[PDB]
Design an enzyme around this catalytic site. Structure first.
Site, PDB file in Angstrom:
ATOM      1  N   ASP A 181       0.763  -1.190   0.509  1.00  0.00           N
ATOM      2  CA  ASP A 181      -0.214   0.080   0.009  1.00  0.00           C
ATOM      3  C   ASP A 181       0.861   1.608  -0.093  1.00  0.00           C
ATOM      4  OD1 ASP A 181      -2.106  -1.222  -0.150  1.00  0.00           O
ATOM      5  OD2 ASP A 181      -1.973  -1.851   2.483  1.00  0.00           O
ATOM      6  N   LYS A 197       2.068   4.975  -0.513  1.00  0.00           N
ATOM      7  CA  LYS A 197       1.648   5.679  -1.734  1.00  0.00           C
ATOM      8  C   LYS A 197       2.393   7.105  -0.581  1.00  0.00           C
ATOM      9  CE  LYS A 197      -2.302   5.025   1.964  1.00  0.00           C
ATOM     10  NZ  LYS A 197      -1.221   3.360   2.170  1.00  0.00           N
ATOM     11  N   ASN A 217       2.583   8.065   2.710  1.00  0.00           N
ATOM     12  CA  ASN A 217       2.980   7.139   3.279  1.00  0.00           C
ATOM     13  C   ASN A 217       3.891   7.034   3.318  1.00  0.00           C
ATOM     14  OD1 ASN A 217       1.180   3.858   3.441  1.00  0.00           O
ATOM     15  ND2 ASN A 217       0.793   5.125   5.205  1.00  0.00           N
ATOM     16  N   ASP A 228       3.844   1.632   7.803  1.00  0.00           N
ATOM     17  CA  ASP A 228       3.236   1.153   7.938  1.00  0.00           C
ATOM     18  C   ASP A 228       3.406  -0.772   6.568  1.00  0.00           C
ATOM     19  OD1 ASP A 228       1.133   2.258   8.714  1.00  0.00           O
ATOM     20  OD2 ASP A 228       0.551   2.808   7.391  1.00  0.00           O
ATOM     21  N   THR A 240      -5.590   5.185  -2.731  1.00  0.00           N
ATOM     22  CA  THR A 240      -5.015   4.704  -2.770  1.00  0.00           C
ATOM     23  C   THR A 240      -5.252   3.514  -4.190  1.00  0.00           C
ATOM     24  OG1 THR A 240      -7.302   2.941  -2.818  1.00  0.00           O
ATOM     25  CG2 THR A 240      -5.473   4.165  -0.755  1.00  0.00           C
TER      26      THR A 240
HETATM   27  C1  DTQ Z   1       2.773  13.790  12.112  1.00  0.00           C
HETATM   28  O1  DTQ Z   1       1.551  13.129  11.555  1.00  0.00           O
HETATM   29  C2  DTQ Z   1       2.208  11.880  11.436  1.00  0.00           C
HETATM   30  C3  DTQ Z   1       3.049  11.293  12.058  1.00  0.00           C
HETATM   31  C4  DTQ Z   1       3.690   9.862  12.001  1.00  0.00           C
HETATM   32  N1  DTQ Z   1       4.845  10.005  12.550  1.00  0.00           N
HETATM   33  C5  DTQ Z   1       5.227   8.689  12.577  1.00  0.00           C
HETATM   34  N2  DTQ Z   1       4.121   7.517  12.778  1.00  0.00           N
HETATM   35  C6  DTQ Z   1       2.732   7.619  12.218  1.00  0.00           C
HETATM   36  N3  DTQ Z   1       2.352   6.854  12.039  1.00  0.00           N
HETATM   37  C7  DTQ Z   1       2.511   5.806  12.069  1.00  0.00           C
HETATM   38  C8  DTQ Z   1       2.338   5.097  13.339  1.00  0.00           C
HETATM   39  C9  DTQ Z   1       2.901   4.402  14.718  1.00  0.00           C
HETATM   40  C10 DTQ Z   1       2.256   2.752  13.519  1.00  0.00           C
HETATM   41  C11 DTQ Z   1       2.190   3.047  12.018  1.00  0.00           C
HETATM   42  O2  DTQ Z   1       1.968   2.119  11.226  1.00  0.00           O
HETATM   43  C12 DTQ Z   1       1.819   4.695  11.434  1.00  0.00           C
HETATM   44  C13 DTQ Z   1       2.625   9.283  12.105  1.00  0.00           C
HETATM   45  C14 DTQ Z   1       1.695   9.538  11.211  1.00  0.00           C
HETATM   46  C15 DTQ Z   1       1.472  10.750  11.508  1.00  0.00           C
HETATM   47  O3  DTQ Z   1      -0.460  11.360  10.842  1.00  0.00           O
HETATM   48  C16 DTQ Z   1      -1.206  10.163  10.794  1.00  0.00           C
END
Ligand code: DTQ
Length: 457
Positions: free
Chosen positions: A133, A135, A138, A154, A173
């Site tokens: 996924d 994109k 991410n 992710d 997506t």
């Molecule tokens: C400042 O914005 C963001 C900052 C982020 N920083 C780290 N992880 C993120 N996502 C995340 C965290 C833990 C596990 C995982 O798979 C994904 C984030 C998401 C954000 O916004 C969506």
């Protein structure tokens, strides 16, 4: 021997945003003060694809991996309703958002970006982890620093959790998904396709596979044909187009690996004058604005629906608690009812709920230590949220309206609702109700009115 509990270790600071599979909350370790980004996945909204044992082992692997272009995972928790993925927080924002804030962007800048993405992907593939996924949302810049690394978030989640079927979760997506993912037989090469789509967008500002709605996009993807005939491709090296062709090769066995793409002439040359790709930046800024407003539109409508649901639930809960039926509950009761309600990833702790009730009470200057007219609490707590939702939509409307016209044209609505996958005769019908003067454009309030009519209001 007792199972570790997320809220015993971490307190929620604020919501960072929405990502694949759930909300992400900025949290802090209650002992060490370490800040982390915690993705909260609800078991009611998201189904597991694998068994417990398979997820646990993946998590255990992910925790041991380390690469400068991959999100760090520190901890994982599970309880009756949720999974909690505790990772490092990144503060530099989404890649495309950083790109459009520059006045200059060249093939050198794109090659350095793609090298990083390919470097992260290469590492993960060596470890038999597939993203599927990939994109632009991410790809987060580690910090606001000039030379901050891109961190891919992710990786490995799609192997364990089922993608949402809701459009508010699917925005963006279709452009990036590899054709073999649609048909069911896929492997790590799908990540090279998605990277190819991203690179095409970096260098031209337009998706290679596009259409007027989600299914039309998917049809183009599945056909797999694209061209470089846009005028802005004349500004671009033959080597960049050669690499794109190799990454967007239809049969995955024939497609370039991530590791081989790192050795490609284009990466080797451009990551060591080069003109600015000004038309591409213009097109990306437009693409991003449109994607963001469609997303904001869908979340606004979702927020209105959640309010219709929660307002009446909270009222019935308090009606039940008000045993002698005089309409008055004390603060401890308001908290218990608000708790029964949330039974909003940021409200999954007794202390966070207490804090929120106190914010509502202070808003209206209700004294916290006596008995309170609960119907007024409900109104205030729900009006706050309705106000917040209205303000987020407006910010996104203003951002999209880059000429400060105050208006969105009929043609622009067609693009926005297409991305939002709102049926054409349906939005056109609602536009005919709202635009009684055939102006062929709407202001903010009118646009908000259309969205309310498109969620049964
Ligand atoms: C400042 O914005 C963001 C900052 C982020 N920083 C780290 N992880 C993120 N996502 C995340 C965290 C833990 C596990 C995982 O798979 C994904 C984030 C998401 C954000 O916004 C969506």
């Amino acid at each position: 021997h007792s199972t570790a509990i997320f809220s015993d270790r971490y307190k929620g600071q604020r919501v960072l945003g929405k990502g694949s599979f759930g909300e992400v909350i900025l949290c802090k370790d209650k002992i060490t003060g370490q800040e982390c980004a915690v993705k909260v996945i609800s078991k009611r909204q998201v189904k597991q694809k694998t068994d417990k044992e398979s997820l646990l082992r993946e998590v255990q692997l992910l925790k041991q991996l380390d690469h400068p272009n991959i999100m760090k995972l520190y901890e994982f928790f599970e309880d009756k309703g949720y999974f909690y993925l505790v990772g490092e927080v990144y503060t530099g924002g989404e890649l495309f958002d950083e790109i459009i804030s520059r006045k200059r962007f060249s093939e050198v800048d794109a090659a350095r970006i793609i090298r990083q993405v390919l470097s992260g992907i290469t590492y993960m593939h060596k470890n038999k982890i597939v993203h599927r996924d990939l994109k632009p949302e991410n790809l987060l810049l580690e910090s606001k620093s000039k030379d901050a690394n891109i961190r891919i978030i992710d990786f490995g989640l799609s192997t364990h959790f089922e993608a949402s079927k809701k459009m508010k979760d699917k925005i963006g997506t279709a452009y990036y998904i590899a054709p073999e993912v649609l048909h069911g037989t896929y492997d790590e090469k799908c990540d090279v396709w998605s990277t190819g789509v991203i690179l095409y967008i970096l260098l031209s500002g337009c998706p290679p596979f596009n259409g007027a709605n989600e299914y039309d996009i998917l049809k183009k993807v599945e056909k797999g044909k694209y061209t470089f005939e846009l005028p802005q491709w004349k500004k671009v090296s033959e080597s960049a187009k050669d690499l794109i062709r190799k990454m967007l090769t239809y049969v995955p066995s024939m497609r370039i690996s991530a590791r081989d793409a790192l050795d490609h002439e284009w990466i080797q040359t451009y990551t060591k004058d080069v003109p600015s790709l000004d038309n591409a930046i213009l097109n990306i800024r437009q693409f991003q604005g449109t994607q963001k407003l469609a997303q904001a539109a869908l979340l606004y409508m979702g927020s209105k629906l959640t309010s219709q649901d929660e307002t009446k639930e909270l009222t019935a809960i308090f009606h039940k608690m008000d045993k002698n039926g005089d309409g008055q509950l004390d603060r401890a009761e308001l908290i218990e009812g608000y708790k029964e309600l949330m039974r909003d990833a940021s409200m999954l702790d007794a202390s966070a709920v207490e804090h929120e009730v106190d914010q509502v009470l202070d808003a209206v200057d209700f004294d916290k230590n006596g008995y309170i007219e609960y119907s007024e609490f409900v109104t205030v707590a729900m009006d706050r949220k309705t106000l917040l939702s209205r303000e987020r939509l407006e910010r996104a409307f203003r951002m999209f309206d880059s000429d400060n016209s105050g208006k969105i044209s009929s043609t622009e609505l067609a693009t926005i609702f297409g991305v939002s996958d709102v049926d054409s005769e349906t939005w056109k019908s609602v536009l005919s109700e709202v635009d009684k003067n055939n102006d062929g454009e709407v202001d903010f309030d009118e646009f908000q009115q259309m969205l309310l009519k498109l969620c049964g209001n």
